[PDB]
Paper text:
Class C Acinetobacter-derived cephalosporinases (ADCs) represent an important target for inhibition in the multidrug-resistant pathogen Acinetobacter baumannii. The class C Acinetobacter-derived cephalosporinases (ADCs) play a significant role in antibiotic resistance in A. baumannii. β-Lactamase-mediated resistance to β-lactams can be overcome using combination therapy involving a β-lactamase inhibitor coupled with a partner β-lactam antibiotic. Many ADC variants have emerged, and characterization of their structural and functional differences is essential. X-ray crystal structures of ADC variants in this study provide a structural context for substrate profile differences and show that the inhibitor adopts a similar conformation in all ADC variants, despite small changes near their active sites.
ADC-212 has a Pro219Leu mutation and also contains an alanine duplication of a couple of residues prior to Tyr221. In the apo X-ray crystal structures of the variants (resolutions ranging from 1.24–1.89 Å), the Ω-loop conformations show more variation than in the complexes. Two of the variants containing an Ala duplication, ADC-33 and ADC-212, begin to diverge in their trajectories starting at Ile209, with the most significant shift in the Cα position (3.4 Å) occurring at the sequence difference between the two: Arg213 in ADC-33 vs Pro213 in ADC-212. The Ω-loops of these variants come back into alignment at Leu216. In Adup variants ADC-33 and -212, residues Leu216 and Asp217 are extended out from the active site, as compared to ADC-7, -30 and -162. Despite sequence differences at positions 218a and 219 in ADC-33 (Ala218a, Pro219) and ADC-212 (Leu218a, Ala219), the structure is nearly identical, with negligible changes in corresponding Cα positions. However, these variants display subtle but noticeable shifts in the side chain of conserved residue Tyr221, as compared to variants without the Ala insertion. Overall, the B-factors of atoms in the Ω-loops are elevated more in the Adup variants, suggesting that the Ω-loop is more flexible in this region of the Adup variants: ADC-30 (loop 20.4 Å2; B monomer 21.0 Å2) and ADC-162 (loop 23.0 Å2; B monomer 22.3 Å2) vs ADC-33 (loop 20.8 Å2; B monomer 18.8 Å2) ADC-212 (loop 21.8 Å2, B monomer 19.7 Å2) ADC-219 (loop 41.4 Å2, B monomer 35.7 Å2). In ADC-212, residues Arg210, Val211, Asn212, and Pro213 all shift away from MB076 (Cα shifts 2.0–5.4 Å).
Numbering used by the authors: 5 to 359
């Protein structure tokens, strides 16, 4: 009786006091039934409660939507994952980065792209110059190094293949196909009352830096708890959706290579299910997140899988996880970052008790 509420109150609610988080939204979906729990405030100053309309910055969870957009384009034949960027972004033809293919960009294996652009790369024109000046380092395809530039280039190519800027790819094609009505790249004026600053580690209000427009594909999406639960629902139960978006979602579930106990899918990290808590924590280790790691081609993909993704901005935290075989998933959104390990542990405690 009210198992989900009790588990969320036991495992997530104490994190607000522990880390002085102003507001948190936790959603659990089980057997196509969505449970939403909210704690605290969207705005400390205004005393406005965090609610089902509150818009949160997703940080790197934005990459799940870029991945879905790439899967959408690929299954309509608009791109091949074996293509290179210069086929679509013609000012990259005859450059060294035109030896990297789109799957390698989407899965962080170009061999010379770090977590962030250099600090001086602030505009899209500087982004293009950066890619023109790029030269290889490690063997292409061999090393995973988690990278915002890498995804940003993949998203730009996807947008070019769809004859629309990236913000419109998501806002006009992908979000509508998923039935998401309050997810945004650019939050409109009519929604600004629902989109407040997040809070930094000193509880000072802070908003994500726009960065060059190409970085929106890496970390620029904002969404609500009900929309994120709908997105999990689409990942668990795609048959309710348009065929082209079913194929896009399916594309993001296929493992592309292995690193230790993790499989890298498009956007999602993938694990054999059941996964130990330690396996899930290891996916967030400094070694995996910050360093190049040699990849291994998949022999046999696990027959039963689960998927997760963390994301943060300076003022927000996100965690999403789903388990097809159990028909369950969970989303956590906060307007202050908390350690990724706390998100993963709390979600593990909830989902493992509702099996």
């Amino acid at each position: 009786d009210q198992e989900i509420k009790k588990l969320v109150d036991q495992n997530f609610k104490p994190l607000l006091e522990k880390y002085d988080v102003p507001g948190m939204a936790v959603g659990v979906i089980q057997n196509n039934k969505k449970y939403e729990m909210y704690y605290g405030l969207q705005s400390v100053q205004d005393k406005k409660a965090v609610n089902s309309s509150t818009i949160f910055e997703l940080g790197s969870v934005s990459k799940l939507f870029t991945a879905t957009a790439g899967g959408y384009a690929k299954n309509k034949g608009k791109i091949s994952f074996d293509d290179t960027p210069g086929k679509y972004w013609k000012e990259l033809k005859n450059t060294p980065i035109d030896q990297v293919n789109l799957l390698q960009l989407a899965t962080y294996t170009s061999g010379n792209l770090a977590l962030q652009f250099p600090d001086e790369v602030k505009t899209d024109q500087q982004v293009l110059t950066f890619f023109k000046d790029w030269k290889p380092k490690n063997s292409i395809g061999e090393y995973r190094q988690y990278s915002n530039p890498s995804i940003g280039l993949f998203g730009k190519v996807v947008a070019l293949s769809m004859n629309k800027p990236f913000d419109q790819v998501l806002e006009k094609t992908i979000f509508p196909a998923l039935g998401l009505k309050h997810s945004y790249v650019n939050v409109p004026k009519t929604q600004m009352q629902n989109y407040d600053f997040g809070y930094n580690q000193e509880n000072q209000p802070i908003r994500v830096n726009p960065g060059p427009l190409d970085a929106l594909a890496a970390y620029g999406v904002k969404s609500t708890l009900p929309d994120m639960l709908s997105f999990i629902h689409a990942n668990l139960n795609p048959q309710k959706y348009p065929a082209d978006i079913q194929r896009a979602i399916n594309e993001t579930h296929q493992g592309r290579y292995q690193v230790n106990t993790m499989y890298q899918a498009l956007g999602w990290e993938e694990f054999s299910y059941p996964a130990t808590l330690q396996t899930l924590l290891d996916s967030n280790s400094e070694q995996i997140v910050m360093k190049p790691n040699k990849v291994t081609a998949i022999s046999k993909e696990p027959s039963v899988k689960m998927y997760h993704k963390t994301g943060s901005t300076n003022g927000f935290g996100t965690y999403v996880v789903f388990i097809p075989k159990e028909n369950i998933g969970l989303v956590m959104l906060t307007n202050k970052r908390i350690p990724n390990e706390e998100r993963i542990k709390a979600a593990y405690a909830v989902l493992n008790a509702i099996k």
